[PDB]
Amino acid sequence: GAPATVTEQGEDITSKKDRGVLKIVKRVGNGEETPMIGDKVYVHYKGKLSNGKKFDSSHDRNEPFVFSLGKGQVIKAWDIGVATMKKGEIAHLLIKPEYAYGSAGSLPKIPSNATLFFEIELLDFKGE
């Protein structure tokens, strides 16, 4: 599946190079620009557990998911991963728990020590 493909072919985009966030570009984006710390970023996403059985998608609305990049408003893996993305890029991320919900998890949906997968489409980004 797409998770195993990220395991096997994904780029490790962590500073520690600990394979905690692995990335495949599924669709190439436009130009060269990637978002700055503090930029408002606008994405669509589909997320799911690898180990267990849980799925959620932003397209559950015609409303992009928005956050401020690099401010700890989202799990660590998203701050790391979305920073690398160009406008219009789709990427797959496979995320070890250290870069997500760790040993606590987020009960009941997300167990302890859970690996997560996301497909992210970076729609746009804009400064304050």
Ligand X SMILES: COc1ccc(CC[C@@H](OC(=O)[C@@H]2CCCCN2C(=O)[C@@H](c2ccc(Cl)s2)C2CCCCC2)c2cccc(OCC(=O)O)c2)cc1OC
Would you call 80 helix, strand, or coil by DSSP?
Answer: helix
Q: Name the one range near ligand X by CB under 6 A: 12-20, 24-32, 83-91, 108-116.
A: 108-116
In the bound complex, what is the minimum distance in angstroms from residue 116's beta carbon to ligand X? 5
* Catalytic annotation present for 42: no
Q: Is 2 helix (H, G, I), strand (E, B) or coil?
A: helix
Kindly name the residue from 75, 80, 90, 120 that is annotated as catalytic.
75
Catalytic residue (one of 42, 101, 117, 125): 101
The C-alpha torsion from 78 through 20 and 29 to 127, rounded to 10°, is 30
Q: Is residue 109 close enough to count as binding ligand X by CB under 6 A?
A: yes
Decide if residue 41 touches ligand X (CB under 6 A).
no
DSSP state of 108: T
**Catalytic site residue from 42, 99, 117, 118:** 118
Say how far residue 1 (Cα) sits from the centre of its chain: 17
Torsion on CA atoms 80, 85, 87, 88, rounded to nearest 10:
-120
Let me know: does 57 contact 65? Beta carbons within 8 Å.
Answer: no
What is the nearest approach in angstroms of ligand X to the Cβ of residue 90? 15
Q: Which of 12, 18, 37, 56 is catalytic?
A: 56
Is 99 a residue that touches ligand X (CB under 6 A)? no
Structure tokens at 85: 């993305």
Active site residues: 45, 55-56, 75, 101, 118
State the residues that interact with ligand X by CB under 6 A: 45, 47-49, 54, 56, 65, 72-75, 78, 101, 109-110, 116
